[PDB]
C-alpha cells in the first residue's frame, strides 16, 4: 500500500456576512474566532491534539431523512464519544444565557481553570466559552448598534485579555491583537472605562497618570479603613503605573498592592477561585478573573496554595494590549524567587520575608514563630555572619508637632503559625495618629498569638 495523506474539505453551505475575525497562532497552538450575522465559526487546536472546529448558526441545514434557538455543527475526527459530548456541551453553553455579560462571566471562569490547571480540556473549553461570549454579544449588538456601542469596550478588552492568558497557558506568546477591529477605538470612552481603554489600546499613559496614581492611593486608603475598593479599576491603574509611572511610582504602587493583599484578602481570592471553578457555579453575580488577580496577583505577596500560576498570569496580563516583559520584576529586580513577601525600599533595596535565612546577608530571625514554619526578615541591597533578632521597643511621641516620624514605615503583623497577616504602610500623619490610638489593623483587638514589627527605611523593631 502506497502511503498518502487523506484530506477532507467541508464548506459551510451559506455565504457568511462576516462582522469580525481574530486569530492567535504559534507552533504550539491555534485559536480562531469568526463572527458573522447569526454565525460563529471557531477553530481551536493544541499541538499533538486533534483540532476542534465548531459552527453555531441561527439556521438549520437541510438533513436527509428516512421515508433551541441555535444549531451546533462539529467538524473533526471525534468518534461518537467526543462527538455526542462536544455537540451537547457547545449547545448547553450557547443556550445557558441570552445575556452576553453572564456568558462573559462563564468565559472568565473557564479561562481561570485553564491558567490554574493547564491542559487540553480546559484550553479547548475556555476557547469555546470566549467565542460563545463574543457571539452572544455580537447577536445582541447587531439589533441596536447605537445602544451597544458603549458595551463594546468591555467585550473587546476581555477578548484581548482572556485570549492572551489562554494562548500562554497553551505555550504561545500572544492572544488576539483585536476582535471587533477598528470599531472599539472609535467609540467614546466613559469615565468608568478610562483606565481599561488606556490598557486595551496602549494609549499614551501621560494624560491618565494622575488618575492611576489617585486610584491606587485611594484604593489603599479605603482598604486600610476596611472599605471595599474597585479592584478592576485598581488592576488597570497598576498596569499603567508599571508601564509608564514617574520616578518611584512602580515602587509606591507595589508597596500598596502588597499592603492591600492581606492574608485574609489572599484567602478571599482563593475562596473566589474555588467558587468560580465549581461545576454548579451560577452567573447571577458577575465574575471577572480580575476579581481574583487584583490586588493579590499584582502584589509582592508570592505565597498563599494550588494557584502559583496566578501571579505569572497577572504579570503577563499587566502588559498593554495596543527590558523585562514582567513589569513587577522590572519594578524591583532585587526580589528573589524564595521571597514569601517583599516590601520595596528606596535605593534599589527591599525588605524580604523567607522561610530560610539568606547566605552572606544581614537577616533577622523572627521571635515567637513555629520552628517548622519559620520567618526570616532580610534586607536585599545590591557579607554578614551575625545572628540578629529584633530589638523590643515601645512607641514614643505621641505629640503631633506636624512632623511625621513613622511616615514611610511599614507596620507588620505576623502569627505564631508563621504567616504574615498584614503589612501596613504608614503614609500620612492621620495613619500615624491612628497607630497611637486604641485604623483597625494597628490598634489592638487580637490576642497573644500575634506579634508586631515596625520596619523603617533602615532597620527593624519589635512592638511593644
Amino acid at each position, epitope marked *: 500500500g502506497v502511503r498518502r495523506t487523506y484530506t477532507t474539505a467541508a464548506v459551510w453551505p451559506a455565504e457568511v456576512a462576516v462582522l469580525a475575525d481574530a486569530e492567535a497562532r504559534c507552533p504550539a497552538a491555534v485559536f480562531n474566532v469568526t463572527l458573522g450575522e447569526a454565525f460563529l465559526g471557531l477553530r481551536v487546536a493544541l499541538r499533538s491534539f486533534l483540532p476542534l472546529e465548531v459552527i453555531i448558526s441561527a439556521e438549520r441545514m437541510r438533513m436527509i431523512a428516512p421515508p433551541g434557538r441555535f444549531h451546533v455543527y462539529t467538524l473533526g475526527f471525534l468518534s461518537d464519544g467526543a462527538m455526542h459530548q462536544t455537540m451537547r456541551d457547545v449547545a448547553a453553553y450557547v443556550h445557558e444565557s441570552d445575556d452576553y455579560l453572564a456568558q462573559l462571566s462563564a468565559a472568565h471562569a473557564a479561562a481561570l481553570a485553564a491558567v490554574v490547571q493547564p491542559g487540553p480540556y480546559y484550553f479547548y473549553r475556555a476557547a469555546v466559552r470566549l467565542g460563545v461570549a463574543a457571539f452572544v454579544f455580537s447577536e445582541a449588538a447587531r439589533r441596536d448598534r447605537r445602544a451597544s456601542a458603549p458595551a463594546l469596550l468591555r467585550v473587546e478588552s476581555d477578548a484581548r485579555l482572556l485570549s492572551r492568558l489562554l494562548m500562554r497557558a497553551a505555550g504561545c506568546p500572544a492572544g488576539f491583537a483585536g476582535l471587533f477591529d477598528g470599531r472599539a477605538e472609535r467609540v467614546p470612552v466613559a469615565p*468608568a472605562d478610562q483606565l481599561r481603554a488606556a490598557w486595551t489600546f496602549g494609549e499614551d499613559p501621560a494624560p491618565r497618570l494622575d488618575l492611576a496614581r489617585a486610584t491606587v492611593a485611594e484604593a489603599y486608603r479605603r482598604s486600610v479603613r476596611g472599605k471595599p475598593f474597585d479592584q478592576q479599576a485598581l488592576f488597570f491603574a497598576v498596569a499603567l503605573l508599571l508601564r509608564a509611572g514617574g520616578p518611584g511610582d512602580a515602587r509606591e504602587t507595589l508597596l500598596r498592592t502588597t499592603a492591600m493583599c492581606t492574608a485574609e484578602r489572599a484567602a478571599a481570592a482563593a475562596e473566589l477561585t474555588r467558587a468560580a471553578l465549581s461545576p454548579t457555579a451560577a452567573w447571577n453575580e458577575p465574575f471577572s478573573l480580575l476579581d481574583v488577580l487584583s490586588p493579590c496577583a499584582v502584589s509582592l505577596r508570592r505565597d498563599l496554595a494550588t494557584l502559583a500560576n496566578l501571579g505569572a498570569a497577572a504579570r503577563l496580563a499587566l502588559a498593554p494590549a495596543g527590558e523585562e516583559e514582567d513589569p513587577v520584576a522590572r519594578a524591583a529586580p532585587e526580589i528573589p524567587a524564595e521571597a514569601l513577601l517583599a516590601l520595596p525600599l528606596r535605593g534599589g533595596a527591599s525588605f524580604v520575608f523567607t522561610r530560610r535565612r539568606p547566605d552572606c546577608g544581614p537577616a533577622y530571625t523572627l521571635g515567637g514563630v513555629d520552628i517548622a514554619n519559620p520567618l526570616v526578615l532580610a534586607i536585599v541591597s545590591n557579607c554578614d555572619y551575625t545572628d540578629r533578632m529584633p530589638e523590643s521597643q515601645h512607641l514614643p511621641a505621641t505629640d503631633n508637632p506636624s512632623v511625621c516620624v513613622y511616615c514611610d514605615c511599614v507596620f507588620v503583623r505576623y502569627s505564631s503559625a508563621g504567616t504574615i497577616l498584614e503589612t501596613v504602610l504608614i503614609e500620612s500623619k492621620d495613619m500615624e495618629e491612628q497607630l497611637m490610638a486604641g485604623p483597625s489593623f494597628n490598634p489592638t483587638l487580637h490576642g497573644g498569638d500575634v506579634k508586631a514589627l515596625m520596619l523603617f527605611p533602615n532597620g527593624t523593631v519589635v512592638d511593644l
Partner: antibody
Framework: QVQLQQPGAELVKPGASVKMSCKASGYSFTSYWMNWVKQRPGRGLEWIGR????????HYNQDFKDKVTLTVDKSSSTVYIQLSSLTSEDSAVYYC???????????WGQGTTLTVSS | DIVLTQSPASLALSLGQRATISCRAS??????????MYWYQQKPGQPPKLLIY???NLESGVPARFSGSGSGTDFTLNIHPVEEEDAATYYC?????????FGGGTKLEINR
C-alpha cells in the same frame, strides 16, 4: 454603563419631611462615595454632604447638619437624603453625584425637583 | 470655609476665539503635589458635567479644546477654539477640606 436614577419630582407641604432617592447601577456600589448637591432656580451649586455606602460614614456641609440625613440601602443599591422642617428655601433640584477616586464628581443623576408647597 | 471666586460672571466671544475663565480660592487647595480643583460645564435642564479634574487633567470624552491650569489659590479654564456647543455655564469646585464648595459660575455666550 454607570447610571444614577433619581425620581423627577417631590411635592411636599411646608413643615413636613421628604426622603429623596438615588438608585445606582453599572459599578460596584460599595466602592464609591455618593455626594448630594443642591441647585436653586437660576442659582449656583451647593455641596450638601457625602455618604460611603459600605459602612454609612458621612461628611456634611455644616450649613446642612440640622436639615439633612444621608442613609443607604445596600440591597437596592440606593442612597437617600432626608430633609426635615421644609420651607420654600428648600425648594431646589437635588443631584446625586458619584465621587471618583480623583475626588471630583464623575457621574450625576438627573436631579429631583423638590417643591415645598401646600 | 474656602470661598471660590470666578471671573468674569459672563463671557461673550466669537467662534474660534479663546475663552479664559479664572477661579480664585480664598486659601490654597493644593496639598502633597495635587491641586483639588475641578471644572464643570452645565447646560439648562441638565446636571453639571466634569471637564477637568485635579486642576489640569482632561476628563475622558472631553474635547482637547478644553484645558485647565493653576496651583495654590489661582486657577484657569481655557477653551480654544470656542465652538457653538460651548455656550453653557462653567463652575469651578474644590475638594480640599470641609465644606466642599463651588464657584459662582461663568456664563459663556457666543457672538455671531
Amino acid at each position: 454603563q454607570v447610571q444614577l436614577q433619581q425620581p423627577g419630582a417631590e411635592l411636599v407641604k411646608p413643615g413636613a419631611s421628604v426622603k429623596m432617592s438615588c438608585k445606582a447601577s453599572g459599578y460596584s456600589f460599595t466602592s464609591y462615595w455618593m455626594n448630594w448637591v443642591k441647585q436653586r432656580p437660576g442659582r449656583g451649586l451647593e455641596w450638601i454632604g457625602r455618604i460611603d455606602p459600605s459602612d454609612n460614614e458621612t461628611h456634611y456641609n455644616q450649613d446642612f447638619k440640622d436639615k439633612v440625613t444621608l442613609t443607604v440601602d445596600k440591597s437596592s443599591s440606593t442612597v437617600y437624603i432626608q430633609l426635615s422642617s421644609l420651607t420654600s428655601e428648600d425648594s431646589a433640584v437635588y443631584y446625586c453625584g458619584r465621587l471618583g477616586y480623583v475626588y471630583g464628581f464623575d457621574y450625576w443623576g438627573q436631579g429631583t425637583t423638590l417643591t415645598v408647597s401646600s | 470655609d474656602i470661598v471660590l471666586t470666578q471671573s468674569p460672571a459672563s463671557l461673550a466671544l466669537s467662534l474660534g476665539q479663546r475663552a479664559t475663565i479664572s477661579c480664585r480660592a480664598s486659601k490654597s487647595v493644593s496639598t502633597s503635589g495635587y491641586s483639588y480643583m475641578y471644572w464643570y460645564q452645565q447646560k439648562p435642564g441638565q446636571p453639571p458635567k466634569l471637564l477637568i479634574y485635579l486642576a489640569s487633567n482632561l476628563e475622558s470624552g472631553v474635547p482637547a479644546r478644553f484645558s485647565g491650569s493653576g496651583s495654590g489659590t489661582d486657577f484657569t479654564l481655557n477653551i480654544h477654539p470656542v465652538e457653538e456647543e460651548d455656550a453653557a455655564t462653567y463652575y469651578c469646585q474644590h475638594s480640599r477640606e470641609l465644606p466642599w464648595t463651588f464657584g459662582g459660575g461663568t456664563k459663556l455666550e457666543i457672538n455671531r
